[PDB]
Amino acid sequence: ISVRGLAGVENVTELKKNFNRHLHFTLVKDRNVATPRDYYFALAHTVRDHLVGRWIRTQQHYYEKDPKRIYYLSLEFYMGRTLQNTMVNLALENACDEATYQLGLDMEELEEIEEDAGLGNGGLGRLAACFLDSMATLGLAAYGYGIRYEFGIFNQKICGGWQMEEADDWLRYGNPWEKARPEFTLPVHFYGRVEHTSQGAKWVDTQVVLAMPYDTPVPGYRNNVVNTMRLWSAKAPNDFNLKDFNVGGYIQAVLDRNLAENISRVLYPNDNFFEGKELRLKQEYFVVAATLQDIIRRFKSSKFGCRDPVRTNFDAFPDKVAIQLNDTHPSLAIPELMRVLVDLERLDWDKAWEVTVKTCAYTNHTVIPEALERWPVHLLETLLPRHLQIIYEINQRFLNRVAAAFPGDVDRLRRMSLVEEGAVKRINMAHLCIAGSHAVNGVARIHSEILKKTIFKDFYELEPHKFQNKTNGITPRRWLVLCNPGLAEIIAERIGEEYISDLDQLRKLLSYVDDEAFIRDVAKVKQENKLKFAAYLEREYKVHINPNSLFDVQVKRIHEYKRQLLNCLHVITLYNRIKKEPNKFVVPRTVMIGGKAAPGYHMAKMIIKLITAIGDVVNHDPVVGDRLRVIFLENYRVSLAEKVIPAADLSEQISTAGTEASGTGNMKFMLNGALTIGTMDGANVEMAEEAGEENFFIFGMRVEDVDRLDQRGYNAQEYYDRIPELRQIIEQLSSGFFSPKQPDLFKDIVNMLMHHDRFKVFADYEEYVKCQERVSALYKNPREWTRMVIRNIATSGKFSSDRTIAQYAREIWGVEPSRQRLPAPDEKIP
Amino acid sequence: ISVRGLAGVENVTELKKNFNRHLHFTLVKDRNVATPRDYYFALAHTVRDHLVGRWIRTQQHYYEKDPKRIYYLSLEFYMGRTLQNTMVNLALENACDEATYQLGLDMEELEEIEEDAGLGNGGLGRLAACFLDSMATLGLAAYGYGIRYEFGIFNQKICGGWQMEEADDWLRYGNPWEKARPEFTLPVHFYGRVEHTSQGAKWVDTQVVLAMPYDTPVPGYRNNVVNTMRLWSAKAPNDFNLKDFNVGGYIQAVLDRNLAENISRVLYPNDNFFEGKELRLKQEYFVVAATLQDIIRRFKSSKFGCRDPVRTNFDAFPDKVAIQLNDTHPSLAIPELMRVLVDLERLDWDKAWEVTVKTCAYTNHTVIPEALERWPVHLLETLLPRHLQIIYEINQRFLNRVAAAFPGDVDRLRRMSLVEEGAVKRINMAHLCIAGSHAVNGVARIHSEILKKTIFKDFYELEPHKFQNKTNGITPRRWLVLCNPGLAEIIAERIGEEYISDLDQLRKLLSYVDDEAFIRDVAKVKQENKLKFAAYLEREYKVHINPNSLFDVQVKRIHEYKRQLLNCLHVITLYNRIKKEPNKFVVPRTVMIGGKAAPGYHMAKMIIKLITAIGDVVNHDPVVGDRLRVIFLENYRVSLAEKVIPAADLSEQISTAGTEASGTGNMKFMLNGALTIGTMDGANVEMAEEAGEENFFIFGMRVEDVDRLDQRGYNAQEYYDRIPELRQIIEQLSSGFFSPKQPDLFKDIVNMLMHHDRFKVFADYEEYVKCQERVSALYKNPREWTRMVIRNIATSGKFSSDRTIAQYAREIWGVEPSRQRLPAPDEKIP
Numbered sequence A, B: 001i002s003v004r005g006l007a008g009v010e011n012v013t014e015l016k017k018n019f020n021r022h023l024h025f026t027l028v029k030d031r032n033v034a035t036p037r038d039y040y041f042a043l044a045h046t047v048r049d050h051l052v053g054r055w056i057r058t059q060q061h062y063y064e065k066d067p068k069r070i071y072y073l074s075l076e077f078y079m080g081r082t083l084q085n086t087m088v089n090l091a092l093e094n095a096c097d098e099a100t101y102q103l104g105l106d107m108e109e110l111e112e113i114e115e116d117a118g119l120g121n122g123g124l125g126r127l128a129a130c131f132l133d134s135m136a137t138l139g140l141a142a143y144g145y146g147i148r149y150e151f152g153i154f155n156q157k158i159c160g161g162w163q164m165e166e167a168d169d170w171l172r173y174g175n176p177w178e179k180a181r182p183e184f185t186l187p188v189h190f191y192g193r194v195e196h197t198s199q200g201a202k203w204v205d206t207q208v209v210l211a212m213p214y215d216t217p218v219p220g221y222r223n224n225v226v227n228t229m230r231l232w233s234a235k236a237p238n239d240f241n242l243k244d245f246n247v248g249g250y251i252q253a254v255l256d257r258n259l260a261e262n263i264s265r266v267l268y269p270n271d272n273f274f275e276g277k278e279l280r281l282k283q284e285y286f287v288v289a290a291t292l293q294d295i296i297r298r299f300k301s302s303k304f305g306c307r308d309p310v311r312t313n314f315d316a317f318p319d320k321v322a323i324q325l326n327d328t329h330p331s332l333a334i335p336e337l338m339r340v341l342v343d344l345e346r347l348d349w350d351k352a353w354e355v356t357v358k359t360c361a362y363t364n365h366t367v368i369p370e371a372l373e374r375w376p377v378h379l380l381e382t383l384l385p386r387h388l389q390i391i392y393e394i395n396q397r398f399l400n401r402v403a404a405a406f407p408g409d410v411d412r413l414r415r416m417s418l419v420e421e422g423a424v425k426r427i428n429m430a431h432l433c434i435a436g437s438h439a440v441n442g443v444a445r446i447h448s449e450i451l452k453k454t455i456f457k458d459f460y461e462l463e464p465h466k467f468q469n470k471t472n473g474i475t476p477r478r479w480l481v482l483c484n485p486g487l488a489e490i491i492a493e494r495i496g497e498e499y500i501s502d503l504d505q506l507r508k509l510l511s512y513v514d515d516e517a518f519i520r521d522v523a524k525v526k527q528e529n530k531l532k533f534a535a536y537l538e539r540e541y542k543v544h545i546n547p548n549s550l551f552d553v554q555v556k557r558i559h560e561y562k563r564q565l566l567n568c569l570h571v572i573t574l575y576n577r578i579k580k581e582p583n584k585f586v587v588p589r590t591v592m593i594g595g596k597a598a599p600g601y602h603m604a605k606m607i608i609k610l611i612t613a614i615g616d617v618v619n620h621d622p623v624v625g626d627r628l629r630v631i632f633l634e635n636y637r638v639s640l641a642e643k644v645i646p647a648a649d650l651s652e653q654i655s656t657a658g659t660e661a662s663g664t665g666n667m668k669f670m671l672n673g674a675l676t677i678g679t680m681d682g683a684n685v686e687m688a689e690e691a692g693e694e695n696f697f698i699f700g701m702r703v704e705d706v707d708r709l710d711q712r713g714y715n716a717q718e719y720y721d722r723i724p725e726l727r728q729i730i731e732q733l734s735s736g737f738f739s740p741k742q743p744d745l746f747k748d749i750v751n752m753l754m755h756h757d758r759f760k761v762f763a764d765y766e767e768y769v770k771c772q773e774r775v776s777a778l779y780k781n782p783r784e785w786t787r788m789v790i791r792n793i794a795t796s797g798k799f800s801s802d803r804t805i806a807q808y809a810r811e812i813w814g815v816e817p818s819r820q821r822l823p824a825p826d827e828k829i830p
């Protein structure tokens, strides 16, 4: 059937009876009233059963051996569905497929019932998910720590071409994967005030919110290792949240509990954008405070909570603990670790600081200013008074370091301060992270250089040793084996299976680049993938596409820097040329654009309306026929990505050079047989560098060109004046060609494009359509297109998160990865 | 060990492995980190497993056979713990005891970990719970329908002698008994307006709240029948509760969902008291609306949703459906059933009314005015506009009936109206229930007569056939076998086990009233019970009592009509007499008073303070010694009741004649070997009548005396003037003898007692202490005390809820009870 494992005689039988056990005992249903949803749960529970054994021995193991622990703090974990992934990592896929088949059910139909764990916005969140899978696969004693939002990223609905947001109640029917652990609930403080008494400061009169943990298993790939992702939930204490007496109402007091519990209710839907709301800040301290207590408790037991030097010496803390900050969201971990060490454990400042810096590491994910976290001092002042004091003190000592290093450089001092003066005083969380971490890293080579040359230049000069780079990656498991079994199979037919946990081995595929059978196969799976997607489209969304055309897709969050607008310009261009010479041949294309817009991002929502507007016109022009279709992919999410990417021919990664830190969708497309048209931005550089620029469609300005243009000054009128095709499009928008009933509908877009385009869309237009013409040319030659594809796939190995994690492990965490199978799952009950 | 069933070889082994299965697979724990709480859950899950099989066949059965269905609507279901009860009803107690023993655990210690299902306030709620158990035991196709509050009755804490309320988070660690059924979620409407168009009215522009059901199994006693208790939970729709667009905030919209969900958040903590809050009304319509849809859906399938006359003829509705209104809380069911039938199903008014009246029955539980539900019209007008219109129409036609029956009786008309004029117009829900039900019943013989003679006199004259009586009862299972296995065993040693489901058989115990062994035994278990309670006291609450003294206990909600104050007066009297003649012998007593006070009931909270105040004085007077102890039982609840009642010697049921509708705690004490000192109130009358007045300690005014006094006019001064002992107590309170630091602390109590005692406490004082002297006398003669006890126990049979239910079934529901074992639980998988 494929190498989804063995469909053993004993195990298929075993599976079936346990499926029935759960349907009866767990779901309390009988075959006569069971629905597909019930069947999905029975299976999920059956599958989950297989990894609890491993989960328990894994955790027990780490307790015995006591290795250094890696704590990945992130406010986002974009998990997606977990049934299939679990089957894949446990080699249960074929057996489950067989068993369910024998039970007269279609496993695939059941898999579609699982709701996505959308606890993330996009890149940053998905990265964390890929990392977890890699850390488990590499045998690291790692823990993912975050917030259990009961409402993840909103579900996107298109009404009249506009985006409509609606709550994502992903827990509505329950989550069979998580395990509530109310017995490990912890208290988290807010507000209050600071008392300075005799031997130390005291955080007093605080409001208490409780943090209840929920553990979700994270299985490594076929190595019997199952790590843990701990998500915190906010709960109100039953005392003060009722006991602070003297009138108010008993009922009201109870109803008001949903005020402390609002902390974990919903994820903020922003991308590369910072919103300074109090609820956000609360979420940030909540996950940090709870997590740290858990970390220290585990440390206090270790082998120190037995003997060792005997005396809670935190000197070994860094040798046993490593906490990675996914961006600045969990940045309060730094001053919080200090608070605990100094205020509670009573360590001297300097010893505490040494420990803190030595255990913390910070990862930066962007360089655009509006994304940078700068919290107003009055907010920190009210909500976390002691943390502010600690920050000021950290700042004080850091600046003194600077002054001593750069005597007299007074401007440098203000530039480097963690405190920003002006309208309102703010705290620069990024500066905080740099100062309190022993390593700072970018997510792509160019992005990392930009940090050193630009944004954090002063810090780099101060401590050059801190700055590193760790190019992002993706998990071959979910992003290949899971979503594209067809491709994985044919690759395995030639080079084996070892590449799934050693993606570098894909290079061996280079020697089949001239293989006639392989070329035919690679081309076949892609055709099968396109057919399946084209079907799904009519199935769940309804209104036909042509599977023979070129599948041109751009899927990612909607943003000005991502330039979906540039994609738009090209689409309109294709349309106008066809209308000009109707009876001239052109390579057919289905351009698919999908992505979510943050609710408050007006422009982004305007662009979504533009895309659908273009489709309204283009898709109903008889002269166009089936040569050009514009489709907006609704509710783009992980599960949807697993469907489009394998069916994509052309991948669009066209952000303005210097704006996309790295990107990861680009890597997803490369490993799945799509060709890339993009700019020298983020990881695109490393990808083209790995496959060879001849096998990549690069175009547009490089970072240097962008800066040159800025010196000069960007004037869009120029481009408008010299390119008639561009002018024609702009006047079509301006006159209502795409919005008849509301002719001025797109005035904001045009206005922006002509007068305040921060991402110089026009500057890259000419080179973009020219480049687009080259891909159309190559598509006309199936054999050569496919051969170029094989060159990309065979050369994507470097982009697996296993590689990324191995680097973090060795160069930052100080731990050694291991592909050693944990001692089976085998029963055991001590 | 006892007749808690057989500890079979095969089953104890089977139990043990499943206990381990759950500990591992369900709790995901290993023996090395498992805590008593974990062990409790493993067991609960193991036990629950045994009744899912029966649960499924029971429900399937009713579907096949299709009998008349009984729907018990109540806003309260005081369930308590359910682990033991389930073991008892399934004959699993000894086997589980053995198995856990072999696993090296103490079952009793684990049982104490289970949280109480406190979804009730007191009598009314517990009645519903006893009823459910009886309906299952009698094989009735019955369903308990209510609201799943996430916060039940508050947990009571005594601080400085005052009551402190704190949220009852009973779901904190999960509820292994319930089964969420999100697939059966239903919509419930609120607000909106009424449109009158061509063919009918339309309830329009309503706000939608969703009702998610949660099913809990209700096992009959050893008959393999497992009925269902369906509790509704409020959930917000993800559309409009987000989709009603045009600014507000996406985050805020999501956080505001906890506004529609507040409907099922907390139970109102009132007793015999009506609070006209909107949230209450919402809760009332919520349970009614959701339940009815479920009822009709089930009806539409039946055997009509196949064939029958073919044409949704609701003429058979009453032959297939019976809905019992537990008080007026679910009274909206009447106008709602009309709305659906008329507005949606399109039946003519008259045919709809005939059906409604024929399927509804109303149970009244009190006669005090402040407890009567009278909803302001402006509230119904805003929240349920169409229901108001229907009510007005019902009223219109009903009054026309009256006018025709009593021509010219204009005052009768206003008296009988469902609409009350005055300050604000209100709707008399009780009048509504009488008009729309075919039967109205009281809960005790005297209470039922009072209804006919007083409160509902006019209605009785109009339709004498509607009024009936159904004396309350209690379940011998929980209230005997479960809480007093010792007593149940010795009874069984003589007369067998058949009495557990046929309590009348207890009469046979009469022939052992002179049996020397029995007398010794009955006396022994009570001594053992007292020792165990005396221990528990020091264990969990701490500060000694004497097990040889007379256990004088009064446990029930704190209320003025319950007269805990009268009990107080007596206690102080005993104290004063001892202080007068220290070296005179008196029978030692431990008087225990426990009960919760509604948060807003100032007087009731003042009484709690008085009781603790008396104990402060009495318990620390050296001259008193161990002859008199005053203890306030904290957080009185079902699980606590199961502990005190079996250890009680004297039961206090001293409400002012005519105020306690029935009472059920009184019955609990009688069946557990306690003697009763009380007034001729509620079921006390029937109890004394059943055991013989010679075996009961009756005292005080009868109903007639109370009325005589009211004609005359009640003047407490008189009693104060003629009884020196009474005067002495009042001046002690007034002068601060019991409250030194705050001398005027009890001015409200004294003031009330002297000037506004609605329950003439003083009028019954003399006859009360005199009577108390007679019980002390009899306690001095162990052999005769015990013989009187045997007379009560042997004669309590009539007070089992099986009897009550059998009567409801035959005289109101029109169904025949059956003690037929359902065809085993045996596997089966169709």
Ligand SMILES: CC(=O)NN1C(=O)N[C@@]2(O[C@H](CO)[C@@H](O)[C@H](O)[C@H]2O)C1=O
Pocket (backbone or CB within 6 Å): A121, A122, A123, A124, A125, A127, A270, A271, A272, A273, A365, A366, A371, A443, A472, A557, A660, A661, A662, A663, A664, A682
């Ligand atoms: C999470 C999100 O929507 N935005 N988002 C960021 O703010 N930073 C992002 O991080 C990812 C992962 O490191 C980068 O690949 C991406 O280029 C960067 O924009 C990213 O995707």
Ligand SMILES: CC(=O)NN1C(=O)N[C@@]2(O[C@H](CO)[C@@H](O)[C@H](O)[C@H]2O)C1=O
Pocket (backbone or CB within 6 Å): B121, B122, B123, B124, B125, B127, B270, B271, B272, B273, B365, B366, B371, B443, B472, B557, B660, B661, B662, B663, B664, B682
């Ligand atoms: C529920 C509650 O606390 N109060 N409460 C009532 O309002 N009515 C009550 O109903 C029960 C059960 O029918 C009666 O026995 C009791 O006498 C009556 O007061 C009762 O106990």
Ligand SMILES: *Cc1c(COP(=O)(O)O)cnc(C)c1O
Pocket (backbone or CB within 6 Å): A121, A122, A123, A126, A555, A556, A557, A636, A637, A638, A641, A662, A663, A664, A665, A666, A668
């Ligand atoms: C991989 C992924 C992303 C990242 O896409 P980019 O093109 O790097 O912005 C975002 N959303 C989902 C659903 C993803 O799978």
Ligand SMILES: *Cc1c(COP(=O)(O)O)cnc(C)c1O
Pocket (backbone or CB within 6 Å): B121, B122, B123, B126, B555, B556, B557, B636, B637, B638, B641, B662, B663, B664, B665, B666, B668
């Ligand atoms: C039985 C019971 C009641 C009823 O007691 P009464 O004396 O009838 O008011 C109230 N609360 C609990 C906990 C009960 O068990």
